[PDB]
Subunit: 97 residues, 3 copies
């Protein structure tokens, strides 16, 4: 269901190992399918986690930009130019949708 | 985080997929599933390390805003950074 | 083929869901390998996205590293000393 955090990944991962145990001991077609249904369900929760992390990175970028502005308004420099370069580069290579 | 264990896991999974496609067998299917579970293990671990590192980044951002406030006081930029940071805190990926 | 962003995971995951529905309705050895194939594809996009995020993480830490420098040159401290510790831990992790 709705994603609550990384602990969701653990509970689906550990349940994934439980299904694997049943598989190695008592193989069966229905069980191979069961394990695949579980992997899918596990992957859908991994995507949500990565999605949320990507949005967090985007928000962090905006905060870093505002910090640069505040630093420029306060102290007016070489380091400031260096930071803006990194932020530009990060903006260019940022993982997004 | 570190990604070698991830790529090392994915490459093995890739090769295992090759055999299964070549000689579809129950043992090879199970061998592939075991590899996927192991790949998802490194994935989930790498995601956990990114989340914990973000949490510390959020804390460093808080200290930064304080260091800026101690030097400069009330600015529109500060209300902006704080409002932004609060929105990042409400939506941070957590446990 | 070429990783373009998290939208790639969403699409491949949806293909993977689609391959599952057929597998479950009418199982067979063909669809099983089809499903696994799609899992490896989705996992590959996932690893790529994660690899890019870890890269972003490194660049962010550098920007914070340069900021703390800028703060030191401007205002001389405890909070900076505190910020240097958090960063050191974070730099150690990566």
């Amino acid at each position: 269901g709705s994603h609550m955090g990384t602990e969701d990944l653990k509970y689906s991962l550990e349940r994934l190992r439980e299904i694997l145990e049943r598989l190695e001991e008592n193989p069966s077609e229905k069980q191979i399918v069961e394990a695949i249904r579980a992997i899918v369900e596990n992957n859908a929760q991994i995507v949500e986690a990565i999605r949320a992390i990507v949005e967090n990175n985007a928000q962090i970028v905006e905060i870093l930009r505002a910090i640069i502005e505040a630093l420029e308004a306060i102290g007016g420099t070489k380091i400031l130019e260096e930071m803006k370069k990194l932020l530009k580069d990060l903006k260019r290579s940022l993982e997004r949708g």
